[PDB]
């Protein structure tokens, strides 16, 4: 599924992002903006051999099982293919799980690039909320 702005906002929102572990909700937006597009089917590999899914790209090689990150963790105990669903839920609890464990929204390497110190409100302006 490939969201609107306005339409993920709202999902995640709901979800409980809104000014979890002090993000507001612009900054969640503008991470999944980036690293995605919007979308969830979205999946990247990196040089080592791990593999990012889903709407905020998360990393197989500490967060998730795809059965061919050899030596890798899977701290959110999930297929990393239900980090592709059009349900978000499942990318969400994963993400408080990783922007809790010490260096906040700095894990998504396209927030601390392109987000970060930034007019992140204007990822929501509009949005009926
Ligand atoms: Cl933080
Ligand atoms: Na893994």
């Not at 709202?10 to 980036?34: E, I």
């Not at 700095?106 to 990822?123: E, L, M, S």
Request: charged fraction near 20%; include cysteine; glycine fraction near 10%.
């Amino acid at each position: 599924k490939v969201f609107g702005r306005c339409e993920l906002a709202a999902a995640m929102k709901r979800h409980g992002l809104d000014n979890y572990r002090g993000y507001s909700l612009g900054n969640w937006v503008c991470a999944a903006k980036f690293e995605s597009n919007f979308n969830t089917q979205a999946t990247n590999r990196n040089t080592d051999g791990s593999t990012d899914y889903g709407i905020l790209q998360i990393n197989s090689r500490w967060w998730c099982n795809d059965g061919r990150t050899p030596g890798s963790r899977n701290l959110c105990n999930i297929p990393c293919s239900a980090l592709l669903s059009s349900d978000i839920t499942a990318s969400v609890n994963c993400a408080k799980k990783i922007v809790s464990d010490g260096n906040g929204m700095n894990a998504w390497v396209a927030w601390r690039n392109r987000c970060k110190g930034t007019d992140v409100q204007a990822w929501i302006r509009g949005c009926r909320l």
